Design a protein around this ligand. Structure first.
Ligand code: NA
Length: 129
């Protein structure tokens, strides 16, 4: 599924991401835009052989099991393919654990490089939330 901007914002808000660990909703929408272009089926391979999955590009090195990242961890206790679903519940619940791990949203390289320090509230402008 490719989400619309306000559709994703509303779904992220319903799942409790708005101001989760102090990150306003526009941060999460900005992160999803530049990580996946709002596409739940997005995948990208990393240099170490791990793969990033889903709308927030969650990495198989630490967070999910894709059966092809030997020696890795599965801290969200899910198969990576669950992160590709049109239902974003698993992505959001895993994202909550990542953002809680000490580094905040700096865990997402696209957020640090393209969202941090900008007017992230602009990403939810016009939405009925
Ligand atoms: Na893994």
């Amino acid at each position: 599924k490719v989400f619309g901007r306000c559709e994703l914002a509303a779904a992220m808000k319903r799942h409790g991401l708005d101001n989760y660990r102090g990150y306003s909703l526009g941060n999460w929408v900005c992160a999803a835009k530049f990580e996946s272009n709002f596409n739940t089926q997005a995948t990208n391979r990393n240099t170490d052989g791990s793969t990033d999955y889903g709308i927030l590009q969650i990495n198989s090195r630490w967070w999910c099991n894709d059966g092809r990242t030997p020696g890795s961890r599965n801290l969200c206790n899910i198969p990576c393919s669950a992160l590709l679903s049109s239902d974003i519940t698993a992505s959001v619940n895993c994202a909550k654990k990542i953002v809680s791990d000490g580094n905040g949203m700096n865990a997402w390289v696209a957020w640090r490089n393209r969202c941090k320090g900008t007017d992230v509230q602009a990403w939810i402008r016009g939405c009925r939330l």
